[PDB]
Symmetry: D2
Subunit: 334 residues, 4 copies
């Protein structure tokens, strides 16, 4: 029994719960969010503007969120050191607040009695993992780890296949990315990111991202070879990586597509998907892939210079990978 | 001769400044916003997703926002008691934070050296005014007043005409309303208003509003005769009042429309507008009216039961009224 | 078996197919759409921006659309008289083009060998039915019938309960309505509906509707007692009825809600739904109800004057009713 | 006087009229659109969801569109051969229907009595020009020409500066592009572009474009050195070029920015703009530039491998260029 708690009952926290409730080996013991009371947590979990109503019975009773008859404790602590993880029997904490992304903050959960923490974001200092790429490098002494970003989980599996087969010499990427909770409904204050304060649903908004650099951390051979940027656009979920790369070995576009298709059918099955259909972003709502290569959308300019397109449900694909990483950690430590 | 300061440099604060800079007798001395430094204030005023670039020169210099040569001091105080309104020579404070809407909160501005405060919102206890309806009832001894809500400013002039002519027995109102800064880009916490936390750009969102009942405060004879609710929809600005009203006297629709046209040409000129064109919400972006009657959109069922439709730029029409009420207070107080 | 064909493979045509595939008594023999070839029909049926991917295998094979092994003939006839319904063994035609909504056009399906036609829209000509309101008035001599509009299917069950219990004296309705295929992505020509040509996703757009007067056709006692209008807003599916009604018998809001709840649990089960939750439009994506009463959103101004709010998935609830009406017609004619 | 007519009174046709009415030497004699009657033409010209109301008097009288006293004949011919251009004294036709983009189609305007045609789109046939880049290659023996695409007009001035100063070895472009009139409000038939049939306001939609390869026609030294693709996103106007380019000569990003700033201040003034502000797409609504380099948004991977960002109001910048090309052609003609 993988006994877990969730800190930060937001987009990622609530969807990680949806995914986790479908895994036989996982018991979600408790969640913590100081802004969400038990009855409110039942409301937020049951109804979802992006991914539909939860197919199951959702209520609250006292301090319990009750889903299909399973009782989940709801705590409301601003300070993770005050969450009763150990007294509740929680061994793994999903750290999905966006607030405790460094080792020093995430360690508070272990102080509070958990054993291990998975940060659902890039971490400035916790080791980072992408399932399908380097989760095999996880060892049980690592108590606090990061599942990287949603963009890194799209880019890294694709870059892995391309680099393995043809070699990546250099690459620049853009993610055309759905809006998120950090943005504003109308022009408002965002002192740390002026563009990000502008009306989210009315603008294309250039943004920064460390996701391309981060690929060189989970694929050390690509260290320093990739960088990138983001354009936030008025869709509510699903994002797309636009990867422009110089290759070491010359290829045709068909050969590149065939290498990606082969990986998607074998070692990257369930992580890297493949399509030749006339897909659009809504076609990936609820997709569990980290990366779906759009074969028809990309374009080759030279035998060593190509643009590759790959989709990802930044909320739900990533949330699935959180749970996958959790189960790999529990299996590797058993 | 009117020396004002602006607290809360947001949608209303910044657009009130836009309007004020166009008024002879107004000198904007300072603004206060603890989240917006001077250089950031210049950026937020210059560029607007809804109302376009400020046609003028906007820069910052030290602690001054500089607009077409005029220097405006920028304070950053969370507590209005700490704002040097008096030392700066500010006589009037435009209270547009949404946080100090009661006499208790707005009085802090006077304790800080200002003389009078106009709250850009309904107030639980401050006297309320709607230009064109009851601003002549303002008396100079009133130091803290409210300019009501954008919705009240749309409904009250319309209701005043209908009541003055045919009489209003009772009326139920819906405002189909653009999203505002209190809403969320994706499903997030909103513990005082659960529907309002849901994805703003992807939902029709019911919301309570006292704006129809508040008409009874500015039109005492309509006390208890109007109420209603709101539906927030994914437009970024401009809203519409849908007033279903029972009349005391039998009328034809042509008769109602003529009465409204007469009012808009005479005593409510510039406040109540009138159109017979095939208008949609974007046609009122930047409109200075409080209320624009849409003659072709309404429908009569019986001679005493009719549905009336009136548009309003909830940001800019209201902001213009804020400045209009300020100039009336100053004049009445001379 | 109920052997059917679908004319017009659009939003309604394709969602009617989705519903019908879940009904054991129905065999979908064929579809016709001159603008959609077989492989394109497979794509349009498989991928849906609003209702997700079809959960099942969708391919095309020569002239057949193939869904979970069941083959469906695809015709491409502009003129319904040329569709080989009789030769194909089709007895019922779902007429969902929007082009053939009168008896004269719909009869061409019967000339072509079908037995009966259900028009998925109001008809100037053909008798109209709303399941849960008057489908037991269907008699087998009626060969061509209309399932009314999506708004009429939301308003009529609600009006039936309120009129049955308290009596409706008069009522005025607004539907705040999602955009549809007749609208335009940017300001474009719509010479019969000038407002309807303006940018659909950027505007609140007033529109005329006969849906409230049509209630008086399916509930004859309400003939002449209801009318209304529409406001199109930038959501892509789900709409809401805003009914302002004068009652004959006085009541509390709670008594009104209780009458609707009882109907929803009894004679209008599956047609009229009932909620007290903090719902928004996306919470009814895929709902099979015609009408979901929003208990917390309405408001009462006098014991005989109240505003009632009811939701509907204008695409999917209506499409479910089309199939329900079809099964009622087949059973009534056996 | 440059006497002109406009064929296709759409987004480009109407905005070309707005621009042309501000040029002293141009007389707009007539417009043609079989779907827009004279009074409807006045409505569509007067009200604009994207660019506001026309600041001027707009009426219709008989068969004339009347703008600030100037009468413009309104024709309604589906076949341009039937437009009485000659009898009306029109010398230059702006061909903005999207339907007559080849020499054979546009020639009908000359058979009907016009002298020269400017197609407001790429042509498979007609020589293409981009103002600021190659309009000095226009010669008056050319009777039918193309102003290329809005994306080519953004990319070409940028590529010219970069190629002139550092040399372009090769480049791959993505345009993140606002929706246009060819898209659909909900999933509908688009048999030649399946992705383009999907819900425009709810999807990121990949699309082909020859815009980058077309730069090689107006800058022949760049033939075969650029290509790219498009992602349509739910904004109603303004688009952005994302150019990933390999340089021949090593550069710092600062030298690149400085070269573009210099060109924007001299030989490309009014065509190529330059900004270092925290801009988003709405900040370029109504901009007359072909291309606005976003200095802060771009990123450098190596001294010869860089990503450059440039904005454009695809409707209004391009419409202004159509009028600029017209005046250049007329100066060289007659
Ligand atoms: N949304 C995405 O697409 C996405 C994808 C991958 C990763 N992430 C990352 O996951 C994290 C969460 O993202 P989100 O999109 O779910 O954000 P969110 O804002 O939806 O959720 C954050 C939650 O944290 C809660 N919270 C805030 N302070 C807290 C505290 N002190 N203790 C406990 N709970 C607290 C909030 O109430 C909220 O419910 C962020 O690091 C983000 O970068 C987001
Ligand atoms: N359409 C409208 O937006 C509209 C119309 C009429 C009235 N109003 C009302 O006007 C008020 C402001 O609304 P808004 O839409 O401009 O909101 P907003 O969020 O755009 O602006 C509020 C501003 O107040 C600032 N602020 C927050 N706390 C502060 C403090 N302690 N001291 C000083 N400044 C502070 C914020 O930083 C922000 O800039 C609200 O009461 C609102 O109900 C809004
Ligand atoms: N969308 C809704 O919410 C809704 C709800 C209730 C009723 N309706 C009604 O249903 C009908 C269709 O609506 P929709 O929204 O599905 O529209 P749609 O445009 O999505 O579908 C109409 C289909 O008819 C096809 N078609 C056109 N001409 C044809 C012909 N001559 N023969 C066969 N097929 C043809 C089109 O190619 C298209 O696929 C309309 O009458 C509409 O008013 C729509
Ligand atoms: N951003 C842009 O919208 C943009 C930018 C650059 C170029 N263009 C190009 O300009 C052209 C028009 O684009 P638009 O966006 O203005 O399209 P639009 O659909 O807004 O306008 C096209 C107009 O042509 C009219 N029309 C159709 N058939 C006709 C005929 N036979 N005779 C006369 N008029 C006819 C239509 O009624 C419509 O008003 C296209 O070639 C397009 O690719 C568009």
């Amino acid at each position: 029994a993988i006994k877990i708690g969730i800190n930060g009952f937001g987009r990622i926290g609530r969807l990680v719960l949806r995914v986790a409730l479908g895994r036989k080996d996982i018991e979600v013991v408790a969640v913590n969010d100081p802004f969400i009371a038990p009855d409110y947590a039942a409301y937020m979990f049951k109804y979802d503007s992006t991914h539909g109503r939860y197919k199951g019975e959702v209520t609250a009773s006292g301090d319990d969120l009750v889903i299909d008859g399973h009782k989940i404790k709801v705590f409301q602590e601003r300070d993770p050191a005050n969450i009763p993880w150990g007294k509740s029997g929680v061994d793994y904490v999903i750290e999905s607040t966006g607030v405790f992304t460094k080792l020093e903050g995430a360690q508070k959960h272990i102080d509070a009695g958990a054993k291990k923490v998975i940060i659902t974001a890039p971490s400035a200092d916790a080791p980072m993992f992408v399932v399908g790429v380097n989760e095999d490098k996880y060892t049980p002494d690592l108590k606090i780890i990061s599942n990287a970003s949603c963009t890194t989980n799209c880019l890294a599996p694709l870059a892995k296949v391309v680099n393995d087969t043809f070699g990546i010499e250099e690459g620049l990427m853009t993610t055309v990315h759905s809006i998120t909770a950090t943005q504003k409904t109308v022009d408002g204050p965002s002192h740390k990111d002026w563009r990000g304060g502008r009306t989210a649903s009315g603008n294309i908004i250039p943004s920064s991202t460390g996701a391309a650099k981060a690929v060189g951390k989970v694929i050390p051979e690509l260290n320093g070879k990739l960088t990138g940027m983001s354009l936030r656009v008025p869709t509510t979920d699903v994002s797309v990586v636009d990867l422009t790369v110089r290759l070491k070995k010359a290829a045709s576009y068909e050969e590149i597509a065939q290498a990606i298709k082969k990986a998607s059918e074998g070692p990257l099955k369930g992580v890297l998907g493949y399509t030749e259909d006339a897909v659009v972003s809504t076609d990936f709502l609820g997709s569990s892939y980290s990366s779906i290569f759009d074969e028809k959308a990309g374009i080759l300019l030279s035998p060593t210079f190509v643009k590759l397109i790959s989709w990802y449900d930044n909320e739900y694909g990533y949330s699935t990978r959180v749970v996958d990483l959790l189960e790999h950690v529990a299996k590797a430590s058993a």
